[PDB]
Design a protein around this motif. Structure first.
Motif, PDB file in Angstrom:
ATOM      1  N   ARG A  49     -40.442-113.032  41.192  1.00  0.00           N
ATOM      2  CA  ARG A  49     -39.756-112.311  42.251  1.00  0.00           C
ATOM      3  C   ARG A  49     -39.515-110.895  41.751  1.00  0.00           C
ATOM      4  O   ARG A  49     -39.730-109.933  42.435  1.00  0.00           O
ATOM      5  CB  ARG A  49     -38.377-112.897  42.610  1.00  0.00           C
ATOM      6  N   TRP A  50     -39.003-110.731  40.545  1.00  0.00           N
ATOM      7  CA  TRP A  50     -38.732-109.397  40.054  1.00  0.00           C
ATOM      8  C   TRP A  50     -40.042-108.580  39.940  1.00  0.00           C
ATOM      9  O   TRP A  50     -40.119-107.383  40.173  1.00  0.00           O
ATOM     10  CB  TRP A  50     -38.197-109.619  38.577  1.00  0.00           C
ATOM     11  N   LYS A  51     -41.087-109.237  39.470  1.00  0.00           N
ATOM     12  CA  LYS A  51     -42.339-108.532  39.278  1.00  0.00           C
ATOM     13  C   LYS A  51     -42.830-108.052  40.604  1.00  0.00           C
ATOM     14  O   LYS A  51     -43.230-106.884  40.733  1.00  0.00           O
ATOM     15  CB  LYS A  51     -43.436-109.413  38.711  1.00  0.00           C
ATOM     16  N   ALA A  52     -42.838-108.984  41.563  1.00  0.00           N
ATOM     17  CA  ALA A  52     -43.339-108.626  42.872  1.00  0.00           C
ATOM     18  C   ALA A  52     -42.531-107.517  43.506  1.00  0.00           C
ATOM     19  O   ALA A  52     -43.088-106.757  44.266  1.00  0.00           O
ATOM     20  CB  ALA A  52     -43.422-109.809  43.849  1.00  0.00           C
ATOM     21  N   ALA A  53     -41.228-107.423  43.239  1.00  0.00           N
ATOM     22  CA  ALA A  53     -40.416-106.399  43.814  1.00  0.00           C
ATOM     23  C   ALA A  53     -40.601-105.086  43.103  1.00  0.00           C
ATOM     24  O   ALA A  53     -40.145-104.064  43.602  1.00  0.00           O
ATOM     25  CB  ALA A  53     -38.940-106.833  43.743  1.00  0.00           C
ATOM     26  N   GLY A  54     -41.248-105.080  41.941  1.00  0.00           N
ATOM     27  CA  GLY A  54     -41.475-103.831  41.243  1.00  0.00           C
ATOM     28  C   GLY A  54     -40.391-103.490  40.265  1.00  0.00           C
ATOM     29  O   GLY A  54     -40.304-102.385  39.708  1.00  0.00           O
ATOM     30  N   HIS A  55     -39.508-104.483  40.058  1.00  0.00           N
ATOM     31  CA  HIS A  55     -38.411-104.216  39.134  1.00  0.00           C
ATOM     32  C   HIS A  55     -38.889-103.761  37.754  1.00  0.00           C
ATOM     33  O   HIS A  55     -38.219-102.952  37.114  1.00  0.00           O
ATOM     34  CB  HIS A  55     -37.463-105.437  38.908  1.00  0.00           C
ATOM     35  N   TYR A  56     -39.998-104.326  37.251  1.00  0.00           N
ATOM     36  CA  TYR A  56     -40.439-103.972  35.878  1.00  0.00           C
ATOM     37  C   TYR A  56     -41.205-102.675  35.905  1.00  0.00           C
ATOM     38  O   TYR A  56     -41.287-101.968  34.915  1.00  0.00           O
ATOM     39  CB  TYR A  56     -41.320-105.101  35.282  1.00  0.00           C
ATOM     40  N   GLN A  57     -41.729-102.338  37.053  1.00  0.00           N
ATOM     41  CA  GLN A  57     -42.467-101.082  37.056  1.00  0.00           C
ATOM     42  C   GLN A  57     -41.782 -99.845  37.657  1.00  0.00           C
ATOM     43  O   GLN A  57     -42.304 -98.747  37.597  1.00  0.00           O
ATOM     44  CB  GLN A  57     -43.827-101.417  37.725  1.00  0.00           C
ATOM     45  N   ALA A  58     -40.643 -99.964  38.286  1.00  0.00           N
ATOM     46  CA  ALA A  58     -40.067 -98.801  38.915  1.00  0.00           C
ATOM     47  C   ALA A  58     -39.694 -97.692  37.954  1.00  0.00           C
ATOM     48  O   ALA A  58     -39.272 -97.939  36.843  1.00  0.00           O
ATOM     49  CB  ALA A  58     -38.858 -99.111  39.764  1.00  0.00           C
ATOM     50  N   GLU A  59     -39.896 -96.484  38.477  1.00  0.00           N
ATOM     51  CA  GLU A  59     -39.577 -95.271  37.750  1.00  0.00           C
ATOM     52  C   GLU A  59     -38.432 -94.517  38.431  1.00  0.00           C
ATOM     53  O   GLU A  59     -38.282 -94.466  39.694  1.00  0.00           O
ATOM     54  CB  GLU A  59     -40.818 -94.393  37.630  1.00  0.00           C
ATOM     55  N   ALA A  60     -37.570 -93.969  37.562  1.00  0.00           N
ATOM     56  CA  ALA A  60     -36.412 -93.231  38.046  1.00  0.00           C
ATOM     57  C   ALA A  60     -36.796 -91.916  38.656  1.00  0.00           C
ATOM     58  O   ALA A  60     -37.626 -91.217  38.104  1.00  0.00           O
ATOM     59  CB  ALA A  60     -35.431 -92.946  36.910  1.00  0.00           C
ATOM     60  N   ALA A  61     -36.220 -91.605  39.807  1.00  0.00           N
ATOM     61  CA  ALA A  61     -36.455 -90.345  40.467  1.00  0.00           C
ATOM     62  C   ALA A  61     -35.120 -89.678  40.350  1.00  0.00           C
ATOM     63  O   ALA A  61     -34.130 -90.293  40.718  1.00  0.00           O
ATOM     64  CB  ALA A  61     -36.694 -90.417  41.977  1.00  0.00           C
TER      65      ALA A  61
END
Ligand SMILES: OC[C@H]1O[C@@H](O[C@H]2[C@H](O)[C@@H](O)[C@H](O)O[C@@H]2CO)[C@H](O)[C@@H](O)[C@H]1O
Ligand SMILES: [Mg+2]
Ligand SMILES: [Mg+2]
Ligand SMILES: [Mg+2]
Ligand SMILES: [Mg+2]
Ligand SMILES: [Mg+2]
Ligand code: NA
Ligand code: NA
Ligand code: NA
Ligand code: NA
Ligand code: NA
Lengths: 1011, 204
Positions: free
Chosen positions: A797-809
């Protein structure tokens, strides 16, 4: 004949099963359980050769040693010697499902031994060989002649070798098949190995002999009188002058004795058993057996002649206790049990499935020391010595037939098939025949995960008929079928139902009360300790204590089944499924224990220890009330130690002797407590210490503890105002703040604190940034795998939501000067594919005192999966020796697994701050922390943290702890909030709602300063 | 409320007032409230509040702010749970939406007067020229908590001048399993020790 592919032939020429014998020829030896010269061990060096199939074995081997064989120790599993690979598969069978056939390439271990037999054993009497454990089937030859065959890898196979041996040297040849139709009944979730893995011995018995004996003990209503009944059977020629004497001893005192000639009472129209006799001995005020006080007597059974010559003697330890279910409750000696159990397989990291007395003892002592009082033989009868240890140390045991057909479709395909009833029958009958005199066994089990079939019903009745002294349980087919006296689910949750079709797993509280239900409920397996787990453990204990009919459970499970391998440098490392080239395999699912394969505890064991305490406490005022959960003993080896400390600073302490009867209460008044010197929280910690050593513990052992917060005096004093004010330097690139010897640098393009200095030393290797993920635990991953994703697993679920890949803006970064400090304000958005996941707004306020106060307010989109954590992280430049903190500890603790931790001041070497789970993941958190000190740094607030030399990224990318490498510096993870770790099971989301970070908006505050 | 600190700082595009207070009784400090008020060039007032509650004091009934506004307006409009009165342990029936009722409907006329008319899960409240935004619970009426607690029959209450606004970051449950022993469940007791909430007050 290929007897190994025929469930109709489970043995050839095997002798009947029976309790442990030794054929003493001296009665005093039998009384004290001394070694018998008539029972010889054949363990040691044997000859062994491996072949790929029985068809490849040379005929020459039957008559002569193969020159190519090697010399190896027996017992052993041949995989452990490297001859072939062990296989770790959970449910799926390791061989093609095509009953009763097995593969044609079927690894065959050819074992042989040349050994001496003295003429005296052959001039009279019978000489039998006993193989206590051979996996999975074998043929035996003696001096070239075929003797017999056997199956059931977990019970002894005995053959008469009388007519086959000769004085002097003799040679045995045992052809052991790895796979057989018995494999169909041996699908337990454990490493699949094979070999002569339990003891081999030779027993000499006279021609006229004791061939079986059953001991029963029955009581009057208050247990103040018992009658011991010993039925004895003989083989050999009946003669009027033969006699049986059964004597009972308590220590060195003879309590009773009775003698009788053979000849039982009339049973039916044809008479009685002329070859049996039943002796009945009265015992007044017997000392009763329990796990609390394992009192034992010794029954010595003598076969002799009237004139007084001893023929032989057999004997056993006898524990006077009654087990019965009454009115929905399982009673022991008339009182209701509270099972603090654990499932325990027979596993040793170097020896495989071979057990030894040291390891057995070590396990029982840790169990007792950890407040366990019971063990389930998952999922087969154990090595005989285990039962003797449990009888003497005192543990309740669930003895279970070696029947598991989990991989069948549907699960009961064989157990509902009458053609499999014979094979299954011997697995149950031979076990009862062997183990029925051990007082430690209190319940029989029909096996594990074999669905529910009519074979089960037949066998359940068989046991009920031959041994009414103990309840019969079995979980297959729904946990509450007609084949179980006890509702014994595996992994049923406390409050949450899992309504699977046909075989639902109801919440345990609800299960008890379904319409028409009245049985006690004791989970056969609960709380799956795989990896960082045991989250939610306390929820079970609170339910077991509140509901009478919830009588406990057996934790899954005791010890990780990891095996040792050696690297290129000869260094050992812990391996799991697939590490031997085995495939398919179930990878790390073979490691689910409270302790590591070497017996080192995982952090979860302390949680179990605390929840399983035998003393409960309440505080009212200054009055501590101690209630005993013992059923039988008074607290006669216990004192209570209490200590009050202010923020970790000791104020006072004392001791008071505990004198509590079983089920009773004791009131202890603490003495007046003077008012603490300054502001803070006073905390009370009490512990129960056993001052005297026991057979299972050292003097000073702590058996129970509890804490409470006492008075709090909140701090209202104003700090003396800074003798200096910080200076801000603004540049297009950064906002820098200087104060004395310190300096802080905020990158304007990233919006993060990117560097700090003390003197001319930089303190950071990576900037301080928000963190919303964790290196996934085994429970976050579940059954998910790359080639076969489980989209429902937290990790996915976290992976699919992009939790591990999100970048701070960066959304905002500003600096302001106040009268006494500098204030940096940031705001960042974390996004994925256009979606804003989290928003972090902070202020950093650095004042004249040199303290940097960080305030953080996070928003979490309601529709994104709740995040693993909400905190900050950074890699510090320094590596210091100690970690010192004021918070819960000393061991690792998580939100849903922190009850055993205590709030105090702790100081440990940095390595203790890392838990070396075999499969690496987030680990080492300490929660409820108000101050943390490392090197020159101090952080204060109310947070959870971990600190170690491994980054989250490294942990999530590494599959085996031995591959981890310390990184430069020290990775610090400081969380305002952390999600629960779960553990009701490791294959489905198990983190309870109250431990999920679903609030939407979170706030936390940290002060970072120098010390 | 003993004052421990009250400061003002001027900033780039606002004024920040910082305060700290301790409530004590007989020498025991029960609660500490630390706040900052940030008034910017837009006219909005952001209030942040961090309260500490002694672990040994009985968990408090609420953690919030209150004032008597001079204004008396006909309607009350809010974005939050409603339309009817709802409390933490009694709000499942209420719905989140935009509600608008006459002021008197924000008062519940229990024959024995007490705290009443709260609405929880509110993100925006409008009354006359005022607007409060955040994530709070609130009640609003012409009667002071003091008046409610000292009056035993609803018919004896009298509208006070202006309007009383009670805005809470947190409010304890009301209970009801019975009415003769404490019945507010643990999860609805304010025992967290430290509480944080924030609101923005602006006009229009
Ligand atoms: O330690 C493993 C554990 O597995 C349980 O079986 C699970 C299995 O792991 C999972 O892959 C599949 O989804 O569900 C099975 C439950 O139906 C066993 O029940 C337990 O005994 C252990 O073997
Ligand atoms: Mg066979
Ligand atoms: Mg001798
Ligand atoms: Mg010879
Ligand atoms: Mg299984
Ligand atoms: Mg609802
Ligand atoms: Na119970
Ligand atoms: Na397993
Ligand atoms: Na004592
Ligand atoms: Na990993
Ligand atoms: Na009133």
């Amino acid at each position: 004949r290929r007897d190994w592919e025929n469930p109709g032939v489970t043995q050839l020429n095997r002798l009947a099963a029976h309790p442990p014998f030794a054929s003493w020829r001296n009665s005093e030896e039998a009384r004290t359980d001394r070694p018998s010269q008539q029972l010889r061990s054949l363990n040691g060096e044997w000859r062994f050769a491996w072949f790929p199939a029985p068809e490849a074995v040379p005929e020459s081997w039957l008559e002569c040693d193969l020159p190519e064989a090697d010399t190896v120790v027996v017992p052993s599993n041949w995989q452990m010697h490297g001859y072939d690979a062990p296989i770790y598969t959970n449910v799926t069978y390791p061989i093609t499902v095509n009953p009763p056939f097995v593969p044609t390439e079927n690894p065959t271990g050819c074992y042989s031994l040349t050994f001496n037999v003295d003429e005296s054993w052959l001039q009279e009497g019978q000489t039998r060989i006993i193989f206590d454990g051979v996996n999975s089937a074998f043929h035996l030859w003696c001096n070239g002649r075929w003797v017999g065959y056997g199956q059931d890898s977990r019970l002894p196979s005995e053959f008469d070798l009388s007519a086959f041996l000769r004085a002097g040297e003799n040679r045995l040849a045992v052809m052991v098949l790895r796979w057989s139709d018995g494999s169909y009944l041996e699908d337990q979730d454990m490493w699949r190995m094979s070999g002569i893995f339990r003891d081999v011995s030779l027993l000499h018995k006279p021609t006229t002999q004791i061939s079986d004996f059953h001991v029963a003990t029955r009581f009057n209503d208050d247990f103040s009188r018992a009658v011991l009944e010993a039925e004895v059977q003989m083989c050999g020629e009946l003669r009027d002058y033969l006699r049986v004497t059964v004597s009972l001893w308590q220590g060195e005192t003879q309590v009773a004795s009775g003698t009788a000639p053979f000849g039982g009472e009339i049973i039916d129209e044809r008479g009685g058993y002329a070859d049996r006799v039943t002796l009945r001995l009265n015992v007044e005020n017997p000392k009763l057996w329990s796990a609390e006080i394992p009192n034992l007597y010794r029954a010595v059974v003598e076969l002799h002649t009237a004139d007084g010559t001893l023929i032989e003697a057999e004997a056993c330890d006898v524990g006077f206790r009654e087990v019965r279910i009454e009115n929905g409750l399982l009673l022991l000696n008339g009182k209701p049990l509270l099972i603090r159990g654990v499932n325990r397989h027979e596993h040793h990291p170097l020896h495989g499935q071979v057990m030894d007395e040291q390891t057995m003892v070590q396990d029982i002592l840790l169990m007792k020391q950890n407040n366990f009082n019971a063990v389930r033989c998952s999922h087969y009868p154990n090595h005989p010595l285990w039962y003797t240890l449990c009888d003497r140390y005192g543990l309740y045991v669930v003895d279970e037939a070696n029947i598991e057909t989990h991989g069948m479709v549907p699960m009961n395909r064989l157990t509902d098939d009458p053609r499999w009833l014979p094979a299954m029958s011997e697995r149950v009958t031979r076990m009862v025949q062997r183990d029925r005199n051990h007082p430690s066994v209190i319940i029989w089990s029909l096996g594990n995960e074999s669905g529910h079939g009519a074979n089960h019903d037949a066998l359940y009745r068989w046991i009920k008929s031959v041994d009414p002294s103990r309840p019969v349980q079995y979980e297959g087919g729904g946990a509450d079928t007609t084949a179980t006296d006890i509702i014994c689910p595996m992994y049923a949750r406390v409050d949450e139902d899992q309504p699977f079709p046909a075989v639902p797993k109801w919440s345990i509280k609800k299960w008890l009360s379904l319409p028409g239900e009245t049985r006690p409920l004791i989970l056969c397996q609960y709380a799956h300790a795989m990896g960082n787990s045991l989250g939610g453990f306390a929820k079970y204990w609170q339910a077991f204590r509140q509901y009478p009919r919830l009588q406990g459970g057996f934790v899954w499970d005791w010890v990780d089944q990891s095996l040792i391998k050696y690297d290129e440098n000869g260094n050992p490392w812990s391996a799991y499924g697939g590490d031997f080239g085995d495939t398919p395999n179930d990878r790390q699912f073979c490691m689910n224990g409270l302790v590591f394969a070497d017996r080192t505890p995982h952090p979860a064991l302390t949680e179990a220890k605390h929840q399983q305490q035998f003393f409960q406490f309440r505080l009212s005022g200054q009055t501590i009330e101690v209630t005993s959960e013992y059923l039988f003993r008074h607290s006669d080896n216990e004192l209570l130690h209490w200590m009050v400390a202010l923020d970790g600073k000791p104020l006072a302490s004392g001791e008071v002797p505990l004198d509590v009867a079983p089920q009773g209460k004791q009131l202890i008044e603490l003495p007046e407590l003077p008012q603490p010197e300054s502001a803070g929280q006073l905390w009370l910690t009490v512990r129960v210490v056993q001052p005297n050593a026991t057979a299972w513990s050292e003097a000073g052992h702590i058996s129970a503890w509890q804490q409470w917060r006492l008075a709090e005096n909140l701090s209202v004093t104003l700090p003396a105002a800074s003798h200096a004010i910080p200076h801000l330097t603004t540049s297009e690139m950064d906002f820098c703040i200087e104060l004395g010897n310190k300096r802080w640098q905020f990158n304007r393009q990233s919006g993060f604190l990117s560097q700090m200095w003390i003197g001319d030393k930089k303190q950071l290797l990576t900037p301080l940034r928000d963190q919303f993920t964790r290196a996934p635990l085994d429970n976050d991953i579940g059954v998910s795998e790359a080639t076969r994703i489980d989209p429902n697993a937290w990790v996915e679920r976290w992976k699919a939501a992009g939790h591990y890949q999100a970048e701070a803006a960066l959304l905002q970064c500003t600096a302001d000067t106040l009268a006494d400090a500098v204030l940096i304000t940031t705001a960042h958005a974390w996004q994925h594919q256009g979606k804003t996941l989290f928003i972090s707004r902070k202020t950093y306020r650095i004042d004249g005192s040199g303290q940097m106060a960080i305030t953080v307010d996070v928003e979490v989109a309601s529709d994104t999966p709740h995040p693993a954590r909400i905190g900050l992280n950074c890699q510090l430049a320094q590596v210091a020796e100690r970690v010192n903190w004021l918070g819960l500890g000393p061991q690792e603790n998580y939100p849903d697994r922190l009850t055993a931790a205590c709030f105090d001041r702790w100081d440990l070497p940095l390595s203790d701050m890392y838990t070396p789970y075999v499969f690496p993941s987030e680990n080492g958190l300490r929660c409820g922390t108000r101050e943390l000190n490392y090197g020159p740094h101090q952080w204060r607030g109310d947070f959870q943290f971990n600190i170690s030399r491994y980054s989250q990224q490294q942990l999530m990318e590494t599959s085996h702890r031995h591959l981890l490498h310390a990184e430069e510096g020290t990775w610090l993870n400081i969380d305002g909030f952390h999600m629960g770790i779960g553990g009701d099971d490791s294959w489905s989301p198990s983190v309870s709602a109250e431990f999920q970070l679903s609030a939407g908006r979170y706030h936390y505050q940290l002060v970072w300063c120098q010390k």
